Design a protein around this ligand. Structure first.
Ligand SMILES: COC1=C(OC)C(=O)C(C/C=C(\C)CC/C=C(\C)CC/C=C(\C)CC/C=C(\C)CC/C=C(\C)CC/C=C(\C)CC/C=C(\C)CCC=C(C)C)=C(C)C1=O
Ligand SMILES: CCCCCCCCCCCCCCCCCC(=O)OC[C@H](COP(=O)(O)OCCN)OC(=O)CCCCCCCCCCCCCCCCC
Ligand SMILES: CCCCCCCCCCCCCCCCCC(=O)OC[C@H](COP(=O)(O)OCCN)OC(=O)CCCCCCCCCCCCCCCCC
Ligand SMILES: CCCCCCCCCCCCCCCCCCCC
Ligand code: SF4
Lengths: 60, 311, 100, 150, 198, 101
């Protein structure tokens, strides 16, 4: 292949090494389940329950 | 007698070196996991023990107590023999490394030649694992990996011949005594880079790694393959420090400390290269091994010879 | 401490073993293997002779011998691949058309 | 009109999610493994907004005959602002780290190429058809759900 | 309580042998290598759990294997289509002991919403399952929770130490159901956040 | 001597401990736990590796004694490496060293 292509490709590889090393120097984005509890929005569709009215009787 | 205690002390030094190298290979399989986590904006295994230190023992126990399995219509001796080669070849190649003044296993007259012998024997692990599995896909993958390995082993020796040409001997202690003023990373920079690529490629590391030839392996044989891979990484990094970075030489710290930091530096760079680089295609890899690196090593040796004969 | 006669006899043993393997085998691959055995035995004999006299010439002849062995193994395996492509069998007795 | 804008925003959020998955999966298929980790972090930002709005991540089932299941929750705009400030730097980093790498270009350029005639005769739509030069997008040719207002 | 396979029995468990069996179980539970197997959307959430924002590698369970021989855990994450069921059975048979199964999602659990002509109604029709995850899809942290449940199940089981010495039976602990374990705290919930806010 | 035989003993112990460790590792793996047509390009690449490996051995022997061979040795190694690169160029230009056509 062309020597210019080889030099440009070597530069791109060096750039990739540099960005991944800088990403190593960055801050972690990991949410530490189960030590860190998962934040769920209020309308999250998880476990189904049956509720009660304010008088204490079951609403169903 | 002083001779007997000197012999036993040297034997104890060799056994200590061997145990530390095997432990370094396994513990830096775990360290590769942790460093991949660190490079990938995550943590890696940090739960099994204090900081994940017992995760490796868990892996070792899991592979020890797995059901041993060999394919039925397959060869048994060749299948069992391939992981032994993949472990033993580079583990034995470590034996020439000078770690510090007074700590060497074999101060051979050949040295570097013994490393070349071990790599040449090391290709048989891939070939044997591919043939013995009685799988067409694994056989084809192993032939591909072996062709790549030969494509880079063909210039590994010359990439080191630059350093031997400067030092005038095959011995390792004389090579590190030839670095008392200038390390070979500066004059043998082409030799430095070509030995880096060759050492990565003969170890089947990223980015140098028809299905794979390890699919039929399981249990403790898979563990042999992987631990032999990381042991080879330790050996290649130590060879790199010995040849191009002065070995034990340093201004302030004790020599073993300097050797340890440089070896750890190059193993960290090994894992960083795994994390960062993308994997090229097959034909591009063989063409970069043959067309670029082999004439580069030949020209590097020629220019090195002309330079050293100039003075 | 090592006799020269013992090294020469070891080389002769390996040479005649390679010759026997060359003759008795119908498969061309084992014929090539026996040829490699014989040439390695000859190179070993040259190493023994050079080491007895304390000369480099034995190892130099060893280098020339293994260069020849590499070239001959390359050519022979190319010919064996050609035979397996054309005739789909490695029986050397079937390659016998010219006679008289 | 508010139904149209809500459905358009949800569809564009999920389109960004799918495209991030596709680009990261392509980069992983080439041989680079770290952009899939970062693209899944961006997918987690999108999933934070989608979880806030619909209460689910992957299969919201939130559109309805005649509208959507609920009104937008209070504070959705802050999460949308956070995602819109987070995304472009990450996308530029993805391009510079993987998409401009010459190894990826050698693996990708010229591979499995077809023109406009082959795309038309096989019913190819989407990015392949537009990559053949044919300017046919449903959101412009046959507009729906208030896409003409954007 | 325990279940025997080669029957409901008691705990069979010397003081060195018990400690070393505990070390075997600890090594097995802290080194779980899942099998790479993409069926449907549940696999997308499973590989989401593998990524950096969740980092299931912290538990030592990130080593994804393309070969069933090197995989200890099979995560059936997706619908069991009738054409894919012999493939799943063959992949499960190709695995080696000890092998564990996690059903991920309603499709793998029971067939889910696809009670249809071309779908097998749950992977436990033909493959034993140790941990079930409800959800469609379960979120990645639910997969991590099922992983922890699998570790608790593994750490309480008794397996043959060697194939030449000792009892070769496999003992699986009949653990308490998670529903009855969490019924104390789940029923006591009174007020939740209103869905109007964020 | 004393140091050379100490190093011989250390090297032999290194050999046997490494081999025994690998064999014991596989023995313990077998013990523990309970039970239940290729193209000619491969030949060409391996053949090229063999030929250039022998030529590399010649350069190995050259490189050790540069300052004992003078400029004549450099000249002879220069014709050697010129024929080396001529063969390499010959292989590259005809398609021998290309995996794909
Ligand atoms: C889906 O993406 C992938 C992963 O998830 C992040 C992986 O973990 C992996 C597995 C690879 C790694 C965890 C890094 C290499 C290190 C490994 C496997 C550690 C093994 C260690 C031993 C056997 C020593 C005992 C692959 C291949 C992958 O493609
Ligand atoms: C020093 C500390 C660390 C030491 C550890 C070891 C380091 C080395 C690790 C291994 C490096 C492997 C390099 C693999 C090279 C593969 C070459 C290749 O595939 O080239 C083909 C590619 C595209 O070619 P093209 O013809 O365009 O494609 C066909 C078109 N459809 O063409 C190209 O991409 C052209 C450029 C090819 C590569 C040039 C050399 C790259 C060297 C690796 C990067 C080093 C980065 C810096 C490292 C730290 C330095 C301090
Ligand atoms: C599966 C098993 C396969 C076989 C494994 C090995 C079997 C034998 C095991 C026991 C070996 C015991 C050690 C032998 C002696 C070691 C010391 C020695 O060789 O000393 C001689 C020489 C010294 O020279 P030097 O010190 O440089 O100069 C001063 C001279 N007094 O130094 C030398 O000559 C050094 C050069 C020779 C070193 C050879 C080391 C072993 C090489 C074979 C490795 C095989 C790898 C596995 C198979 C690969 C795939 C087939
Ligand atoms: C990856 C590196 C593996 C190295 C294995 C060998 C370790 C040998 C340790 C020797 C320690 C003592 C060295 C001589 C004394 C100089 C240093 C004194 C302070 C430690
Ligand atoms: S359970 Fe739901 S999310 Fe999982 S595979 Fe089935 S349809 Fe997809």
């Amino acid at each position: 292949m062309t020597l210019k292509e080889l030099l440009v490709g070597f530069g791109t590889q060096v750039r990739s090494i540099w960005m991944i090393g800088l990403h190593a120097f960055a801050k972690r984005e990991t949410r530490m389940y189960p030590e860190e509890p998962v934040y769920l929005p209020p309308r999250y569709r998880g476990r189904i329950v049956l509720t009660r009215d304010p008088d204490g009787e079951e609403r169903c | 007698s002083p001779e007997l205690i000197e012999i036993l002390l040297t034997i104890l030094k060799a056994v200590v070196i061997l145990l530390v190298v095997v432990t370094c290979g396994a513990f830096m399989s775990f360290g590769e996991r942790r460093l991949l986590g660190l490079f990938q904006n995550r943590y890696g295994p940090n739960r099994v023990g204090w900081g994940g230190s017992l995760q490796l023992v868990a892996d070792m126990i899991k592979m020890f107590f797995k059901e041993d399995w060999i394919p039925k219509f397959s060869d048994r001796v060749i299948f069992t023999l391939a992981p032994m080669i993949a472990f033993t070849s580079l583990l034995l190649a470590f034996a020439i490394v000078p770690v510090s003044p007074g700590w060497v296993v074999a101060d051979l007259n050949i040295g570097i030649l013994f490393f070349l012998m071990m790599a040449g024997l090391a290709v048989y692990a891939v070939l044997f694992a591919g043939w013995s599995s009685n799988n067409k896909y694994s056989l084809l993958g192993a032939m591909r990996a072996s062709a790549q390995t030969l494509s880079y082993e063909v210039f590994l020796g010359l990439s080191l011949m630059g350093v031997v040409a400067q030092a005038g001997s095959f011995n390792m202690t004389d090579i590190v005594n030839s670095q008392a003023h200038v390390w070979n990373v500066i004059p043998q920079f082409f030799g430095f880079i070509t030995f880096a690529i060759a050492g990565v490629a003969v170890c089947h590391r990223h980015p140098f790694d028809a299905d794979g030839y390890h699919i039929e392996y399981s249990g403790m044989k898979f563990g042999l393959f992987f631990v032999g891979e990381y042991i080879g990484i330790v050996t290649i990094s130590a060879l790199m420090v010995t040849l191009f970075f002065g070995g034990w030489q340093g201004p302030l710290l004790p020599p073993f400390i300097w050797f340890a930091l440089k070896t750890a530096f190059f193993m960290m760079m090994f894992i960083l290269i795994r994390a960062s680089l993308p994997r090229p295609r097959y034909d591009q890899v063989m063409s970069f091994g043959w067309k670029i690196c082999l004439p580069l090593t030949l020209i590097n040796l020629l220019v090195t010879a002309a330079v050293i004969l100039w003075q | 401490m090592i006799p020269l006669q013992h090294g020469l006899i070891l080389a002769a043993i390996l040479f005649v073993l390679g010759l026997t393997g060359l003759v008795i085998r119908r498969n061309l691959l084992f014929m090539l293997i026996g040829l490699e055995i014989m040439i390695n035995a000859s190179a070993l004999a040259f190493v023994v002779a050079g080491s007895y006299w304390g000369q480099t010439d034995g190892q130099v002849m060893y280098i020339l011998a293994i260069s020849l062995a590499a070239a001959e193994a390359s050519i022979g395996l190319a010919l064996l691949l050609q035979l397996h492509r054309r005739r789909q069998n490695l029986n050397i007795d079937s390659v016998s058309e010219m006679r008289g | 009109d508010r139904v149209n804008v809500i459905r358009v925003m949800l569809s564009e959020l999920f389109r960004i999610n799918s495209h991030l998955l596709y680009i990261s999966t392509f980069i992983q298929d080439v041989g680079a493994m770290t952009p899939v980790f970062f693209a899944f972090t961006d997918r987690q930002k999108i999933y934070d907004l989608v979880e806030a709005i619909t209460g689910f991540r992957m299969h919201p089932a939130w559109f309805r005959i005649g509208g959507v299941a609920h009104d937008l929750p209070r504070g959705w705009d802050r999460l949308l602002r956070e995602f819109l400030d987070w995304m472009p730097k990450r996308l530029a980093s993805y391009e510079k780290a993987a998409l401009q790498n010459t190894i990826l270009k050698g693996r990708s350029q010229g591979v499995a190429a077809y023109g406009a005639k082959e795309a038309l005769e096989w019913g190819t739509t989407g990015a392949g058809l537009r990559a053949t030069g044919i300017d046919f997008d449903v959101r412009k040719a046959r507009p729906y759900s208030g896409y003409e207002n954007f | 309580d325990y279940t025997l396979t080669r029957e409901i029995v008691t705990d069979p468990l010397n003081v060195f042998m018990g400690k070393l069996n505990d070390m075997v179980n600890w090594g097995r539970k802290n080194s779980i290598w899942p099998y790479n197997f993409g069926l449907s959307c549940c696999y997308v959430e499973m590989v989401t759990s593998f990524t950096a924002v969740h980092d299931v590698a912290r538990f030592g369970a990130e080593v994804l294997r393309a070969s069933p021989r090197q995989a200890d855990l099979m995560v059936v994450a997706g619908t069991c289509f009738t054409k894919m069921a012999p493939v799943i059975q063959r992949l499960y048979d190709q695995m080696l002991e000890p092998k564990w199964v996690i059903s991920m999602g309603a499709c793998a659990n029971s067939g889910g919403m696809y009670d249809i002509y071309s779908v097998v109604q749950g992977v436990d029709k033909f493959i034993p399952v140790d941990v079930y995850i409800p959800g469609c899809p379960p979120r990645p942290e639910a997969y991590m929770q099922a992983l922890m449940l699998l570790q608790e199940s593994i750490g309480k089981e008794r397996r043959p130490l060697s194939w030449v010495v000792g009892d070769q039976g496999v003992y699986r602990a009949n653990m308490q159901s998670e529903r009855e374990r969490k019924r104390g705290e789940r029923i006591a919930v009174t007020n939740l956040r209103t869905p109007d806010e964020i | 001597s004393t140091e050379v035989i100490a190093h011989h003993w250390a090297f032999a112990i290194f050999l046997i401990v490494a081999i025994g460790l690998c064999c014991l590792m596989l023995v313990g793996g077998w013990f523990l736990g309970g039970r239940a047509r290729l193209s000619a390009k491969f030949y060409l690449v391996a053949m090229f590796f063999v030929i250039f490996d022998v030529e590399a051995l010649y350069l190995f022997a050259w490189s050790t004694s540069i300052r004992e061979s003078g400029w004549v040795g450099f000249v002879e190694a220069a014709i050697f490496i010129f024929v080396l690169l001529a063969g390499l160029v010959y292989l590259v230009r005809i398609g021998a060293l290309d995996w794909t056509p």
